[PDB]
PDB file of C-alpha atoms and ligand atoms in Angstrom:
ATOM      1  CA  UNK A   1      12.290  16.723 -15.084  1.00 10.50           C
ATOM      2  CA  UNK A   2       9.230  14.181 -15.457  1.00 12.02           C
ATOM      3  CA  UNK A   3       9.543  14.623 -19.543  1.00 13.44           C
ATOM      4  CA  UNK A   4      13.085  14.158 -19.707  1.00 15.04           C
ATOM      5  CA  UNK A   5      12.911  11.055 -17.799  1.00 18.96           C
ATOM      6  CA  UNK A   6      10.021   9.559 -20.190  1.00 18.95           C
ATOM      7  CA  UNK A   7      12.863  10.778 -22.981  1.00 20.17           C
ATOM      8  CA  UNK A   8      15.399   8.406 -21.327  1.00 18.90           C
ATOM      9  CA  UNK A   9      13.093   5.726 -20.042  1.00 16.32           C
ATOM     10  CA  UNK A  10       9.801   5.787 -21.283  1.00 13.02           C
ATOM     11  CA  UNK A  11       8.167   2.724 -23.250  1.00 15.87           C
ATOM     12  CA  UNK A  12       7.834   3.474 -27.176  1.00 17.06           C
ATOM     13  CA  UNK A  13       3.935   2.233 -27.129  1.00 20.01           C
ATOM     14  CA  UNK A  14       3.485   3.244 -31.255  1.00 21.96           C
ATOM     15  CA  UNK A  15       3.375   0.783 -33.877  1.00 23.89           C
ATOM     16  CA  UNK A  16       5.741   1.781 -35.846  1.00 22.93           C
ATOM     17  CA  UNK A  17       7.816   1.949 -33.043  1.00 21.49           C
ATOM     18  CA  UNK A  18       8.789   5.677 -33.954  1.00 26.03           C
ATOM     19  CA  UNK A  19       9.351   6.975 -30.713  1.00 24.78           C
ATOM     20  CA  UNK A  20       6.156   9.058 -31.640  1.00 28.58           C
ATOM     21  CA  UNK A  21       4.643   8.399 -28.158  1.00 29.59           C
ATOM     22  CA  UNK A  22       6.456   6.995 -25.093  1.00 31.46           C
ATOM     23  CA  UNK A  23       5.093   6.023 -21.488  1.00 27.89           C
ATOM     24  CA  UNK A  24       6.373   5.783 -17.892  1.00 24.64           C
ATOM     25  CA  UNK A  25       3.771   4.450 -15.357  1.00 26.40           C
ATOM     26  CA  UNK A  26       4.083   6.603 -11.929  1.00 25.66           C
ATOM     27  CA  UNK A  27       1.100   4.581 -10.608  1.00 20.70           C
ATOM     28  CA  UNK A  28       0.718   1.052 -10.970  1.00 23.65           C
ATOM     29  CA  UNK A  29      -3.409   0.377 -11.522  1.00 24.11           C
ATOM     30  CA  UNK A  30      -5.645  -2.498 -10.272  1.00 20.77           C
ATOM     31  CA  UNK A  31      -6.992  -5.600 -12.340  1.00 22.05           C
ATOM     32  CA  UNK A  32      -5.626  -7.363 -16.165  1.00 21.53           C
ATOM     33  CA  UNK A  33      -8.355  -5.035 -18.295  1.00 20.79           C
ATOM     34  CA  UNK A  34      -7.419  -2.104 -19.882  1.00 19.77           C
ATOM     35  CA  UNK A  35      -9.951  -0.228 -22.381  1.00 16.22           C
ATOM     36  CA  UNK A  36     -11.114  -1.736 -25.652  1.00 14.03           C
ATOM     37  CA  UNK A  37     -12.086   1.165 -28.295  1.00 13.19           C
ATOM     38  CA  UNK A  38     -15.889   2.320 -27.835  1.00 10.48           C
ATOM     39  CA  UNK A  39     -15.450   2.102 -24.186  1.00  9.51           C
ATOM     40  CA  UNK A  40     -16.408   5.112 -22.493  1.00  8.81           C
ATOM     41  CA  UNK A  41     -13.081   6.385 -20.424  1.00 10.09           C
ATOM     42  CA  UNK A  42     -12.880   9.018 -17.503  1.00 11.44           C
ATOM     43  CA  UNK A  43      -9.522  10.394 -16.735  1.00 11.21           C
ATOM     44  CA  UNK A  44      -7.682  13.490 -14.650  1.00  6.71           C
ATOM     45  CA  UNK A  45      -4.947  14.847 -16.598  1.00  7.93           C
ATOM     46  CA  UNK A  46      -2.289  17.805 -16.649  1.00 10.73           C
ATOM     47  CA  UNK A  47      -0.799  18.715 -19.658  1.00 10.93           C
ATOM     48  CA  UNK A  48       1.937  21.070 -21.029  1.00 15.52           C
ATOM     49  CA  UNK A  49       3.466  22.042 -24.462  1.00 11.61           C
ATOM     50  CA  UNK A  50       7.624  20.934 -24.386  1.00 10.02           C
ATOM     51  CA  UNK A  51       8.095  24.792 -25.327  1.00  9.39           C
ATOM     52  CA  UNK A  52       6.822  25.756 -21.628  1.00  8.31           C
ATOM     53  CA  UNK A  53       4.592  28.086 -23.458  1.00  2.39           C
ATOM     54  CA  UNK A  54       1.301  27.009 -22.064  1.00  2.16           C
ATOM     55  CA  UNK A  55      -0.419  23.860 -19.448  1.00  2.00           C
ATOM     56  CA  UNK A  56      -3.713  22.608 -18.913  1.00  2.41           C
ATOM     57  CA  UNK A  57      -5.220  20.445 -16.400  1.00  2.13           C
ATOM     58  CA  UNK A  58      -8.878  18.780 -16.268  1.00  2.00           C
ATOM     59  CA  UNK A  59      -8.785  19.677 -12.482  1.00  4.59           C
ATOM     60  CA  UNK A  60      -9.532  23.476 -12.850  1.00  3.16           C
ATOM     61  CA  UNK A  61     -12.491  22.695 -14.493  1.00  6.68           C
ATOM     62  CA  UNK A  62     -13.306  20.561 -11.947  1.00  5.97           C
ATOM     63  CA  UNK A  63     -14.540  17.818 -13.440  1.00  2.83           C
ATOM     64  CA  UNK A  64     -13.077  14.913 -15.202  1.00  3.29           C
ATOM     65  CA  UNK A  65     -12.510  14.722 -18.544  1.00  2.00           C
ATOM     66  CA  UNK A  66     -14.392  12.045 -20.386  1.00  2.00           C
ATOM     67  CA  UNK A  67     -14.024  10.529 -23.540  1.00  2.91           C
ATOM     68  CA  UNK A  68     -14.790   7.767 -25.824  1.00  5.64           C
ATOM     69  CA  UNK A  69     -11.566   5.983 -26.870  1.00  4.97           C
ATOM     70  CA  UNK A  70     -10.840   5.713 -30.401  1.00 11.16           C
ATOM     71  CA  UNK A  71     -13.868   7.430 -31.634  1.00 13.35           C
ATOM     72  CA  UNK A  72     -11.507  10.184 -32.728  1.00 11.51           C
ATOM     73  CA  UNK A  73     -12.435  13.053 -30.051  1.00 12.32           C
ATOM     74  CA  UNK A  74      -9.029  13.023 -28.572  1.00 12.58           C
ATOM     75  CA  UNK A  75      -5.414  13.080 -30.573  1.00 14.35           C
ATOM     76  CA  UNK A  76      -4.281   9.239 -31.830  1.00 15.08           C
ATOM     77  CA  UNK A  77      -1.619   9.378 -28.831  1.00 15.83           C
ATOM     78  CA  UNK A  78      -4.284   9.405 -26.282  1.00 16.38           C
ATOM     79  CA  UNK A  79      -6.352   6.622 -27.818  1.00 14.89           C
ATOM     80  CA  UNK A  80      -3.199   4.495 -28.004  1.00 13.75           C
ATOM     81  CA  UNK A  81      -2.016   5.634 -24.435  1.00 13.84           C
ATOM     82  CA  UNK A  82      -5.014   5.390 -23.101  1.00 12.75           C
ATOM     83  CA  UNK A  83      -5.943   2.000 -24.090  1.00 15.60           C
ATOM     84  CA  UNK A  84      -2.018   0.599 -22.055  1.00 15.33           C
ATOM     85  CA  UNK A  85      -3.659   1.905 -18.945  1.00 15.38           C
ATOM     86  CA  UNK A  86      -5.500  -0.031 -16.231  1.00 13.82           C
ATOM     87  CA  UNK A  87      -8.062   0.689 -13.744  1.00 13.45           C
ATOM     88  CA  UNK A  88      -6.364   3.539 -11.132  1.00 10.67           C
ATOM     89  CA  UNK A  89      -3.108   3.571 -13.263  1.00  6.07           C
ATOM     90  CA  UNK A  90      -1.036   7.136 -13.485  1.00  5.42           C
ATOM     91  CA  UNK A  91       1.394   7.599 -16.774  1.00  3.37           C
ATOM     92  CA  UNK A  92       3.298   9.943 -18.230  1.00  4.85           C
ATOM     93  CA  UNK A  93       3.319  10.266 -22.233  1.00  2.96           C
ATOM     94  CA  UNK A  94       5.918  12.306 -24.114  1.00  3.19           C
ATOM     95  CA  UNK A  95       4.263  12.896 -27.641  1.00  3.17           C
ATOM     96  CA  UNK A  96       5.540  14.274 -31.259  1.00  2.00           C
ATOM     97  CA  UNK A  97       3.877  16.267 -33.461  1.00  2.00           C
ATOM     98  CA  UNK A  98       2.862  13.291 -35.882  1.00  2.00           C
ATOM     99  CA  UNK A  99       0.532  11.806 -33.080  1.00  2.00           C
ATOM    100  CA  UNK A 100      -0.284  15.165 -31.541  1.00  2.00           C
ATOM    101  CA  UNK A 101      -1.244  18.646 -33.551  1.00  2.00           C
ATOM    102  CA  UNK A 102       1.005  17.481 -36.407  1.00  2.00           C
ATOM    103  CA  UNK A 103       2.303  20.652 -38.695  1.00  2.00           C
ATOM    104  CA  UNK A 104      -0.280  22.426 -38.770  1.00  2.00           C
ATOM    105  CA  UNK A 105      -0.741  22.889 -34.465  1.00  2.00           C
ATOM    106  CA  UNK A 106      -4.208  23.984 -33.787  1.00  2.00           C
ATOM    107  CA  UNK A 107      -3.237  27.729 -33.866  1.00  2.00           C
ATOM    108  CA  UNK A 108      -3.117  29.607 -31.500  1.00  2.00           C
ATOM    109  CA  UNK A 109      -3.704  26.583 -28.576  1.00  2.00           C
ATOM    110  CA  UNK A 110      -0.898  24.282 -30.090  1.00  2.00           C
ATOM    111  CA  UNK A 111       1.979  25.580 -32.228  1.00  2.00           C
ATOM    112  CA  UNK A 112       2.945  24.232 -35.335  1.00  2.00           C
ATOM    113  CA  UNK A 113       5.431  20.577 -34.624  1.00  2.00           C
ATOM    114  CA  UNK A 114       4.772  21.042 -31.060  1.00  2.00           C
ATOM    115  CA  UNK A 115       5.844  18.069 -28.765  1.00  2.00           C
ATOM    116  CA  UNK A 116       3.292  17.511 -25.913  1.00  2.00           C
ATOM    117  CA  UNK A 117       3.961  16.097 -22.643  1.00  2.00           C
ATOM    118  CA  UNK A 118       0.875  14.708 -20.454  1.00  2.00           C
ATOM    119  CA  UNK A 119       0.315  12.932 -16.814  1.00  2.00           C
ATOM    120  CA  UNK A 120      -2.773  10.793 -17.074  1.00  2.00           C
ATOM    121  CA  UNK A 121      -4.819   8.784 -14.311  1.00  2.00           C
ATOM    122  CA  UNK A 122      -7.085   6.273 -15.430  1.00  2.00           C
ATOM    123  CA  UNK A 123     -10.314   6.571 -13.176  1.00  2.00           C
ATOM    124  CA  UNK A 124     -12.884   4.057 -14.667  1.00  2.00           C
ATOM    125  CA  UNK A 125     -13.917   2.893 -18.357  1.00  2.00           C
ATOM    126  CA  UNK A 126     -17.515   1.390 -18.829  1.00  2.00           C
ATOM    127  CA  UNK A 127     -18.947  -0.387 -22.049  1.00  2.00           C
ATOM    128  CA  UNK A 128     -20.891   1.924 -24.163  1.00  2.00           C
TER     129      UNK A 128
HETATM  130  C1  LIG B 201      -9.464  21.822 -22.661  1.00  2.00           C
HETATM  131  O1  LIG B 201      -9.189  22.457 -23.909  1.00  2.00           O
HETATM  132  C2  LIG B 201      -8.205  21.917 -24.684  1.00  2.00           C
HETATM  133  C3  LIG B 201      -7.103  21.252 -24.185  1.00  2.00           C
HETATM  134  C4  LIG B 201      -6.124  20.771 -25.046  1.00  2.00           C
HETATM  135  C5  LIG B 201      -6.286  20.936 -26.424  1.00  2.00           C
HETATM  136  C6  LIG B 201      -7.383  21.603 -26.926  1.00  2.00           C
HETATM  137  O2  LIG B 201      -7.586  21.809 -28.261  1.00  2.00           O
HETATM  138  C7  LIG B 201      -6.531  22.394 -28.985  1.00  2.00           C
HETATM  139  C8  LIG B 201      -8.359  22.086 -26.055  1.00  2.00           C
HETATM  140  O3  LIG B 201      -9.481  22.736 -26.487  1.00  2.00           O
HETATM  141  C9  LIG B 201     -10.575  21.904 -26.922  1.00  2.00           C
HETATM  142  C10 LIG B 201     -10.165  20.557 -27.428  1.00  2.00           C
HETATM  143  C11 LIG B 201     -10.282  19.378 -26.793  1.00  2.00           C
HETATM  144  C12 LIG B 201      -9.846  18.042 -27.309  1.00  2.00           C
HETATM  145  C13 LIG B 201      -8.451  18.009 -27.964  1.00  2.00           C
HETATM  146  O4  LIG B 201      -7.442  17.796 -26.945  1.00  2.00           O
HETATM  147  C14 LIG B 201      -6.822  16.609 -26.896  1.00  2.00           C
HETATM  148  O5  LIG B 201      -7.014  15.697 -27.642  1.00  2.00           O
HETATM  149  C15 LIG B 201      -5.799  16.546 -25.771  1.00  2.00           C
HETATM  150  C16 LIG B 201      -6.099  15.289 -24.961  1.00  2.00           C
HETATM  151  C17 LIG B 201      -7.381  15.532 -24.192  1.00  2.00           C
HETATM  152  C18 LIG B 201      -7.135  16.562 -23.148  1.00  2.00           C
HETATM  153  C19 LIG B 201      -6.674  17.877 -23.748  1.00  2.00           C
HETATM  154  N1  LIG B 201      -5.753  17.739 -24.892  1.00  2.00           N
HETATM  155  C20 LIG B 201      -4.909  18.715 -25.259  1.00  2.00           C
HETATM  156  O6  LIG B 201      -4.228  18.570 -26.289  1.00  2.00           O
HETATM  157  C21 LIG B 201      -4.911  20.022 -24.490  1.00  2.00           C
HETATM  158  C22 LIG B 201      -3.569  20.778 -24.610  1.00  2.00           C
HETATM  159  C23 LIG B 201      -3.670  22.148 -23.949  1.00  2.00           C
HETATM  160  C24 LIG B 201      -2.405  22.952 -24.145  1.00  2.00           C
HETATM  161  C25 LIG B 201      -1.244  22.210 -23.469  1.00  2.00           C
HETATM  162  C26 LIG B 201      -1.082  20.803 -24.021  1.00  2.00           C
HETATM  163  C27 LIG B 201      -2.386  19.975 -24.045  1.00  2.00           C
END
């Protein structure tokens, strides 16, 4: 499956190169720029806990989902997946709990150590 796959050849995009977050591109965006922190980001994305248990996609609520990146709104493995992506770009980012919910999950949404698995396309990014 698309997960598994990011497991065997996804890009380890954390700092501490912990495996904590790693990336396939499916869609290969337009121009050099990717986001700088402050910028104001707009994104589709479908989402699912690893257990199976429960998914989530900005699309049923029919609107995009917007955010500003590394203004801590979103969990730390969006703002540093986010920011790899350009203009258009689709990815898919496996995610452990350390960058994610961590131990304590955000009960009952996100279990405790939960691994998350997202697909994410880029739409725009202006400067706040
Ligand atoms: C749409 O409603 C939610 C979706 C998710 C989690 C939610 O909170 C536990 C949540 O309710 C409100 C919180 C929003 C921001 C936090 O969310 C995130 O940072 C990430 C990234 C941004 C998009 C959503 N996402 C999530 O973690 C989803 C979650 C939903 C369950 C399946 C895995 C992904």
């Amino acid at each position: 499956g698309a997960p598994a796959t990011v497991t065997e050849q996804g890009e380890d995009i954390t700092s501490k190169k912990d495996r904590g977050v790693l990336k396939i591109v499916k869609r290969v965006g337009n121009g050099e720029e990717t986001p700088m922190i402050g910028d104001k980001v707009y994104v589709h994305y479908k989402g699912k806990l690893s257990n199976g248990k429960k998914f989530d996609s900005s699309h049923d609520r029919n609107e995009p989902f917007v955010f500003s990146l590394g203004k801590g709104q979103v969990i730390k493995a969006w703002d540093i997946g986010v920011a790899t992506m350009k203009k258009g770009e689709i990815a898919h980012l496996l995610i452990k709990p350390e960058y994610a919910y961590g131990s304590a999950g955000s009960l009952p949404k996100i279990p405790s150590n939960a691994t998350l698995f997202f697909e994410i396309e880029l739409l725009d990014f202006k400067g706040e």
